[PDB]
Scaffold this active site. Structure first.
Site, short mmCIF file in Angstrom:
data_model
loop_
_atom_site.label_atom_id
_atom_site.label_comp_id
_atom_site.label_asym_id
_atom_site.label_seq_id
_atom_site.Cartn_x
_atom_site.Cartn_y
_atom_site.Cartn_z
N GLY A 190 44.35 34.49 36.48
CA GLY A 190 44.83 34.07 35.25
C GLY A 190 45.35 35.14 34.34
O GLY A 190 45.88 34.78 33.53
N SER A 245 46.16 38.46 35.02
CA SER A 245 47.02 39.25 35.86
C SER A 245 48.19 39.32 34.64
O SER A 245 48.93 38.46 34.17
CB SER A 245 47.49 38.84 37.30
OG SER A 245 48.38 37.84 37.40
N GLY A 246 48.80 40.57 34.54
CA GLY A 246 49.97 40.76 33.72
C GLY A 246 49.65 41.30 32.39
O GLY A 246 50.34 41.74 31.54
N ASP A 250 52.89 47.58 40.24
CA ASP A 250 52.73 46.38 39.85
C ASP A 250 53.12 46.45 38.50
O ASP A 250 51.98 46.42 37.48
CB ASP A 250 51.42 46.13 40.00
CG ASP A 250 51.27 44.57 40.08
OD1 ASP A 250 52.37 43.86 40.19
OD2 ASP A 250 50.20 43.93 40.05
N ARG A 255 34.59 53.02 45.58
CA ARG A 255 34.46 51.49 45.14
C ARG A 255 35.37 50.52 45.96
O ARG A 255 34.99 49.54 46.44
CB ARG A 255 34.36 51.10 43.78
CG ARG A 255 33.54 51.69 42.84
CD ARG A 255 32.08 51.47 43.06
NE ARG A 255 31.31 52.41 42.40
CZ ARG A 255 30.30 53.35 42.76
NH1 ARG A 255 30.20 53.32 44.20
NH2 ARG A 255 29.55 53.93 41.99
N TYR A 256 36.34 51.25 46.56
CA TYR A 256 37.65 50.42 47.37
C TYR A 256 37.61 51.23 48.53
O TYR A 256 38.95 51.81 48.73
CB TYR A 256 38.92 50.43 46.36
CG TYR A 256 38.55 49.08 45.57
CD1 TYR A 256 38.74 47.95 45.69
CD2 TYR A 256 38.21 49.35 43.97
CE1 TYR A 256 38.32 46.61 44.97
CE2 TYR A 256 38.03 48.46 43.10
CZ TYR A 256 38.17 46.92 43.73
OH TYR A 256 38.09 46.01 42.73
N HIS A 294 53.72 41.28 40.41
CA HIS A 294 53.00 40.21 41.40
C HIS A 294 53.22 38.80 40.87
O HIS A 294 53.05 37.69 41.49
CB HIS A 294 51.58 40.49 41.93
CG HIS A 294 50.77 40.21 40.97
ND1 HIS A 294 49.98 41.09 40.27
CD2 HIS A 294 50.27 39.08 40.30
CE1 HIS A 294 49.06 40.72 39.50
NE2 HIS A 294 49.16 39.26 39.50
C1 LIG Z 1 46.97 25.20 34.57
O1 LIG Z 1 47.63 26.62 34.75
C2 LIG Z 1 46.73 27.38 35.54
O2 LIG Z 1 45.85 27.13 36.11
N1 LIG Z 1 47.34 28.48 35.86
C3 LIG Z 1 47.00 29.62 36.74
C4 LIG Z 1 45.54 29.95 37.15
C5 LIG Z 1 45.33 31.08 37.78
C6 LIG Z 1 46.30 32.08 38.33
C7 LIG Z 1 47.84 31.67 37.78
C8 LIG Z 1 47.93 30.85 37.09
N2 LIG Z 1 48.69 32.42 38.49
C9 LIG Z 1 49.09 32.75 39.41
O3 LIG Z 1 48.55 32.04 40.59
C10 LIG Z 1 50.16 33.55 39.48
C11 LIG Z 1 50.13 34.63 40.90
C12 LIG Z 1 51.55 35.17 41.17
C13 LIG Z 1 49.13 35.42 40.61
C14 LIG Z 1 48.23 35.93 41.51
C15 LIG Z 1 47.00 36.92 41.03
C16 LIG Z 1 46.15 36.73 39.93
N3 LIG Z 1 44.95 37.49 39.62
C17 LIG Z 1 44.39 37.32 38.80
O4 LIG Z 1 44.77 37.22 37.62
C18 LIG Z 1 43.20 38.46 38.57
C19 LIG Z 1 43.46 39.69 38.17
F1 LIG Z 1 44.66 40.26 37.79
C20 LIG Z 1 42.42 40.90 38.33
C21 LIG Z 1 41.30 40.63 38.92
C22 LIG Z 1 40.24 41.54 39.04
C23 LIG Z 1 41.10 39.27 39.42
C24 LIG Z 1 42.05 38.37 39.34
F2 LIG Z 1 41.92 37.06 39.83
C25 LIG Z 1 45.90 35.03 39.60
N4 LIG Z 1 46.29 34.35 38.70
C26 LIG Z 1 45.89 33.09 39.18
C27 LIG Z 1 45.08 33.00 40.24
CL1 LIG Z 1 44.38 31.92 41.30
N5 LIG Z 1 45.19 34.51 40.73
#
Ligand SMILES: COC(=O)Nc1ccc2c(c1)NC(=O)C[C@@H](C)/C=C/C[C@H](NC(=O)c1c(F)cc(C)cc1F)c1nc-2c(Cl)[nH]1
Length: 238
Positions: free
Chosen positions: A186, A188-189, A93, A161-162, A44
């Site tokens: 942030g 994720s991965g 993923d 839960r889901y 993702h």
């Molecule tokens: C100054 O630099 C920054 O501010 N960079 C920054 C900040 C936030 C994020 C970044 C990059 N990445 C991306 O937007 C990349 C996209 C393609 C990923 C989306 C899903 C991901 N989601 C998660 O990290 C995530 C989990 F993996 C599990 C759970 C339970 C909850 C979560 F939000 C997530 N990462 C962010 C956000 Cl809002 N959402």
């Protein structure tokens, strides 16, 4: 990471920060070193990424502030997304980044072992989710790599839960029934690292959840054990 604490330098040497340079340079996702030219991350992460030319991999980082224009990084030769991947909530993923150069192993950067196919029966009790993600829903990327010990949750319990989702065996969940400790925006991965017989194993890849660290909403991770053969297929290709 919600409810975590700062990591010590060299605590998670497989942890990487994957940055994008388009439009401006910023942290994009986490990842794990699994081989001298391989990063294991979430598929993702590359939504809208049209080229690996905009990607920079930083290993041996504790603090985001260690990254400046003069900071060395690894370029990405290739992005390998699992063929069946549609979206995080549906599974598959998982992605591999093939680095343009070889990572030199040291106390600051080295690989994490993949789980053994003979270890899908083992019950991991010492699991940690790491990352530079938010500590709450409305926040900013943290400077210091955060860590949180999270308990693993059964598929049956995660599926309760889901309601509305199909939690497959290719997904692994983790979290406390009352929330408070989890991956957030942030992270994720990044890895879900579990220590077993004094050896760390990459049990999961931070994928998704409903919000962050909510009561009765465990974080959902890619169950790495289910993709050992796919990782080997892509990394050990003749
Ligand atoms: C100054 O630099 C920054 O501010 N960079 C920054 C900040 C936030 C994020 C970044 C990059 N990445 C991306 O937007 C990349 C996209 C393609 C990923 C989306 C899903 C991901 N989601 C998660 O990290 C995530 C989990 F993996 C599990 C759970 C339970 C909850 C979560 F939000 C997530 N990462 C962010 C956000 Cl809002 N959402």
């Amino acid at each position: 990471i919600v409810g975590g604490t700062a990591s010590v330098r060299g605590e998670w040497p497989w942890q990487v920060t994957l940055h994008t340079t388009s439009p401006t340079q910023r942290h994009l996702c986490g990842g794990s070193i699994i081989g001298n030219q391989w990063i294991l991350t979430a598929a993702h992460c590359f939504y809208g990424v049209e080229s690996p030319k905009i990607l920079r991999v930083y290993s041996g980082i504790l603090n985001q502030s260690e990254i400046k224009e003069d900071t060395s990084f690894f370029g990405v030769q290739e992005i390998i997304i699992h063929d069946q991947y549609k979206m995080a909530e549906s599974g598959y993923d998982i992605a591999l980044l093939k680095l343009e150069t070889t990572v030199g192993y040291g106390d600051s950067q080295r690989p994490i072992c993949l789980p053994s196919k003979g270890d899908r029966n083992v019950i991991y009790t010492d699991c940690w989710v790491t990352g530079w993600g938010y500590r709450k829903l409305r926040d900013k990327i943290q400077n210091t790599l955060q860590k949180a010990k999270i308990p693993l949750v059964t598929n049956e319990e995660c599926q309760k839960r889901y309601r509305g989702h199909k939690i497959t065996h290719k997904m692994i969940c983790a979290g406390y029934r009352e929330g408070g400790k989890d991956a957030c925006k942030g992270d994720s991965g990044g890895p879900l690292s579990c220590k077993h017989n004094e050896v760390w194993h990459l049990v999961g890849i931070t994928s998704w959840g409903e919000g962050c660290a909510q009561r009765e909403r465990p974080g959902v991770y890619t169950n790495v054990v289910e993709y050992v053969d796919w990782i080997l297929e892509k990394t050990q290709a003749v």
